[PDB]
Amino acid sequence: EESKIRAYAQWMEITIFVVNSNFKVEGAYLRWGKFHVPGDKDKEISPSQINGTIIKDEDSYTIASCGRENASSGTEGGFSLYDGDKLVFEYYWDCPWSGSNSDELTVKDKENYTVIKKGGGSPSGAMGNIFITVVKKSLEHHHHHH
């Protein structure tokens, strides 16, 4: 009952909201901690339950991970988002039990997508809530082919 309070003290929730296409989560993994149903750290889900998830246009989806009860140095992992067969971004976080939070968002097609993260990086204490927006550029607005 106090093993978990401790381990749960390092936690993140990442919400991906998308516009102008349907996108797919793939490549989710963890090296430390567990994934779980957002809002309920006692309900673990696997990478495989995340991978393949489609985020529909004008919807979001949240991934959540925290420390493992009586085990882990916090949470450390990542995932990738695709638009069909096109890799849009790779995300990675390392939020250790004892140490400084870090992350990294690698945008793979800046030309066709606007991808913006809020939260994340290197805050104190628990990693916390992180938000990524992804907008597939509309030619009539962005004129982004040339």
Numbering used by the authors: 9 to 154
What does the literature reporting this entry say, word for word?
Here we report the discovery of a two-component WCR-active protein, AfIP-1A/1B, from the Gram-negative bacterium Alcaligenes faecalis. While the amino acid sequences of these proteins bear little similarity to known corn rootworm-active proteins, cross-resistance evaluations, competitive binding studies and comparison of protein structures indicate that AfIP-1A/1B kills WCR through a mechanism that is similar to Cry34Ab1/Cry35Ab1. AfIP-1A represents a 441 nucleotide gene that encodes the AfIP-1A protein of 146 amino acids with a deduced molecular mass of about 16.1 kDa and predicted pI of 4.8. Cell lysates of cultures of all transformations were inactive against WCR in diet assays when each protein was assayed alone but proved insecticidal when both proteins were present.
We were able to determine structure of AfIP-1A(I20M, T135M), an insecticidal variant of AfIP-1A, to 1.8 Å resolution by x-ray crystallography. In the P21 crystal form the structure of AfIP-1A is a dimer with monomers consisting of 11 beta strands with one short α-helix at the N-terminus. The N-terminal 8 residues in both monomers are missing from the model due to the lack of electron density in this region, indicative of a highly flexible N-terminal polypeptide. Three surface loops, residues 77–82, 103–109 and 128–131 are also highly mobile with weak or missing electron density. The monomer structures are virtually identical except for the above 3 surface loops and the flexible N-terminal polypeptide segment. Superposition of the two monomers on Cα atoms gave an RMSD of 0.0906 Å (calculated with LSQKAB28) over 118 residues. The superimposed structures reveal a high degree of structural similarity between Cry34Ab1 and AfIP-1A. The RMS deviation between main chain atoms of the β-sandwich (105 residues) is 1.92 Å. The major structural divergence is observed within the region spanning AfIP-1A Pro46-Ile62 and Cry34Ab1 Thr33-Asn37. Cry34Ab1 has a simple four amino acid coiled region connecting β3 and β4 whereas AfIP-1A contains a three residue turn, five residue β strand, and five residue α helix in the structurally equivalent region.
